[PDB]
């Protein structure tokens, strides 16, 4: 859906920014510094889940640019695996949120976080 590569770069960076916000805003809850309201969390995780599926389609062929490493394109299969694992961890977070269990949530949150990091290590400049 993009006219120039720059437009895909801007879309994905935007999507990733939103994801960051929706994920990162739960840190105080998870650490116990903010109160835990199951419903609030469930709903935030629902938004997070939607957002988390969005960036990937904006790393299509010829969208080189931004802080994305070329390896994303040279090593597509490995990138895809990285994204799938990430999304899978997201499913897990969602399950924890739906169960309204802080322990499970904390654990799941950590797993999501390691997944973001694993990708960045390999594919973000």
Binding site for ligand HEC (CB under 6 A): 9, 12-13, 16-17, 19-20, 23, 66-68, 82-83, 86, 112, 115-116, 119-120, 123-124
Q: What size, in residues, is the chain?
A: 125
Q: Any known ligand binding at 13?
A: yes
Q: 12 a known binding residue?
A: yes
Burial class (CB in 10 A: 0-12, 13-18, 19+), 1: exposed
Query: What's the min distance (Å) between Cβ of 14 and ligand HEC?
Result: 7
Give one DSSP letter per residue of 49-102, joined into a string. HHHTTSGGGGS-TT---TTB-THHHHTHHHHHHHHHHHHHHHHHHHHHHHHT-H
Min CB(93)–ligand HEC separation in Å: 9
**Closest to ligand HEC by CB, 38 or 85:** 85
Q: How far is the CB of 113 from ligand HEC (least distance, A)?
A: 7
Residue ranges of the binding site = 12-13, 67, 116, 119-120
């Amino acid at each position: 859906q993009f006219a120039k590569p720059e437009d895909a770069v801007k879309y994905r960076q935007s999507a990733l920014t939103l994801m960051a916000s929706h994920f990162g805003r739960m840190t105080p809850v998870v650490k116990g510094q903010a109160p835990y309201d199951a419903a609030q969390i469930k709903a935030n995780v629902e938004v997070l889940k939607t957002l988390t599926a969005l960036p990937w389609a904006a790393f299509g062929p010829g969208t080189e640019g931004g802080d994305a490493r070329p390896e994303i394109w040279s090593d597509a299969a490995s990138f895809k695996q990285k994204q799938q694992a990430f999304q899978d961890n997201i499913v897990k977070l969602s399950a924890a949120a739906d169960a309204g269990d802080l322990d499970k949530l904390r654990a799941a949150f950590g797993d999501v976080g390691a997944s973001c990091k694993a990708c960045h290590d390999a594919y973000r400049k």
